[PDB]
Design a binder for these strands. Sequence first.
RNA 1: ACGAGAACGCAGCACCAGCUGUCCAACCUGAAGAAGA
RNA 2: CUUCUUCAGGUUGGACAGCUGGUGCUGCC
Lengths: 138, 138, 138, 214, 214
Amino acid sequence: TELKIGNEKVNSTNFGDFAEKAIRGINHKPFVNSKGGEQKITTSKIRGILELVNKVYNRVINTNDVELSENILADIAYIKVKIAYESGREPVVKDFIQRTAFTAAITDVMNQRTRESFLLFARYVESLIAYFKFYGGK
Amino acid sequence: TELKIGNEKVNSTNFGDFAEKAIRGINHKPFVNSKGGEQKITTSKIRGILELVNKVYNRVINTNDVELSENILADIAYIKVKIAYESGREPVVKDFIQRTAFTAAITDVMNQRTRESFLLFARYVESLIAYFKFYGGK
Amino acid sequence: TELKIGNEKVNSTNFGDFAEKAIRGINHKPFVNSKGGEQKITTSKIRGILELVNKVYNRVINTNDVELSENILADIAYIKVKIAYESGREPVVKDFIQRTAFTAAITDVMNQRTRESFLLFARYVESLIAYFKFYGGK
Amino acid sequence: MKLVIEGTIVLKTGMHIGGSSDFSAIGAVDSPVVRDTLTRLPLIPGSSLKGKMRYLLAKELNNGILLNEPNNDQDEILRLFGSSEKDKIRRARLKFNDIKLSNLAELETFNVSSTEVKFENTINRKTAVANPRQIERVIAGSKFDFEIFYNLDDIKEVEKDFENIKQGFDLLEFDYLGGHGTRGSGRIAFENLSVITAVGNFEKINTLNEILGA
Amino acid sequence: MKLVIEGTIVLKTGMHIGGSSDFSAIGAVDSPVVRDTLTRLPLIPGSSLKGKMRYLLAKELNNGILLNEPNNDQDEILRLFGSSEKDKIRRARLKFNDIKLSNLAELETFNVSSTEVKFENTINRKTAVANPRQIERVIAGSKFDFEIFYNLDDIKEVEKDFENIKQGFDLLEFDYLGGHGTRGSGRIAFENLSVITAVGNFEKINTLNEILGA
RNA sequence: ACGAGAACGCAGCACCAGCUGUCCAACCUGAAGAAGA
RNA sequence: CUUCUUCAGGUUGGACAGCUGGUGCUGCC
């Protein structure tokens, strides 16, 4: 629990509702590009976020330590670096990363340094992708 | 696993934050030209530096060996030589190297000689490029 | 993999540092001429030397041989001829070649007669020139 | 009785089989090749080899056309690769294995690693701008020693099974294995195709070799 | 079927295709060529040949107006080269392969290497500053022996496919293959073009040769 | 001298069968050895 | 006895993303 987001707090029970709220906020009022918008992020761009998170979820799902190891923490920091990098490449990705406060959750995971915190963060991201599905498509 | 960027030791978890600090410091207070001007390092030059790091990282990563062999260390010393050449050619590149500890980081890798040290160095340089793309833009 | 220029030259952790200290020793005590010191040997003398070494190096890279062919040995001999003539032209090139042991390296790679020593020597000369541009200019 | 089909897979061009588990940097590789996790040695999954061989053989044996579902292939393919249909389950007479590359010492003699980096790009036909990628690829000349288990169930149709095995192997030789085959990659070759008895001895085992080597 | 389109490509002027992953030296070479990792021989990537052929054939089959997405081309281009169009995904009939250098023997007798290094310039009419670069180019006089596999999906679509393949090869003749082609590099010529069947024999295969060997 | 005493919820059983990490994509774009030696 | 030794952009982009089938039966009070 205790996953800070920037304006609110998602505990272990409250990731799916926040994810659906963020997706609705994304689905409502789509992004504005140079040409007034308006296309939305692609399924194979939230893909990259999902496999990035899973590349540590697979390594943390099967363990019993309360606090994450230095190898897992390094990979979470690297996920943060990657999500910072790819946001600069495309603006339709950066609005997804901002409106859904990925960076605050990652930083809180890196501050808690606990297994349950990262499990909650991964659950939040997975619910986010799941809710992008069934609202959009393509 | 404990790099020696400047006067502050860099571990395997603070590479992203310290690279972000390095990029923001350069972005906020940039290099001043000799002829009373302001300019940064281009994306092409830092991308070439990353390519240089990618040349050796692409062969180091496909290994399980604890310590880098003599060929990898020779290539790392050559990359340090090319860093010195780039610093001597364009003063903005020298400034970019000096504001970070990219020379000091490569010297620390050369002195440690372990695979994990260069892995952390590659992580740090990748994060430098990531936060250039995020902050400097394109 | 092992070179002899008088100070147990090695491919790893040795060529860049030794080229740098040779360049520093050159710059620490400027060459003495008539009637003023600090001749400031430009890159024009240093290039050309680099150009010959690198044309031989270009012909060598696309050759997977443990030992250099007789054509490459004659190319190295012509390298030595050019270096001797250029040193005889003005004494500052003599000082640069003698202090950096260019001729000693040429003789050592001529004795070893293997591609590893030639690539080490070319890497060394490129290190000399890179550190000259780093600690000098023009 | 059970038989072991040995042989070597030699790469003719670079061969890429996808699958990615960790740490794809932002300037180094965009599609790594599948590797043996312990030894880091690149491998040919038995799933991919089996699937490509089954596809080519099922297409060849049926009519030259193949649009059906795997559990509705021809009877040779069904009996040799298996069938999960409710009321008609064929137990597979082939057990493919994961295939690690064997001639790494031979590659190291030539002072090369087992994998290369291939630089590709796509050019947008509108603006003529290129989008570069970086495909890791197992270098040509790599050799993959394999072992396929054949469960000798019917003593009489083993010959037709092995003729179809050789036919599928030869179909692979004029095709690609894994990855971006139509764009140059994936070419392979087969050599030292020999079937041996897992335990005991088989009467037509000298016949099964000469219908594998020829 | 599995028709095999063999031939030979010869460079009239030195061709440059990049994709090296080695340390470029201070004054040695700023841009080398793509070569095989094991044999160190210059390479023509079958992806480069496939992409340039698709561009050239597609533009000439689109009245010199090529602007669409690759998956949004005419039917014949897709059925020869493949496309992931959502419902009717088309498999590439043409299987290009990474083409390796072949005539090293005659070049060796000629006392020449397969590659050369060219210094040209980057000069300016304005404040006189030049930026010299070093392009490695495969020696003109190089032969690349290729084998492009073909899929005979339907016998009606064989002669049209092969005449289109021949005209795509002959469109490359008045063009280059890759690299700095706008600046006097990359001219290629195709010789010894033909086709054979991988397995068995095919009816009217000589019609293919008479429209591909001439 | 306890509605008691004695009594294994136990024996047999493969989380398994079928399934290409595939498809499309050019390492590509732009760039005189001149010039008073 | 001269004068630069490469510079500037694209670093992957889309497509699919788990489907089908079995699914506690037999022996004891």
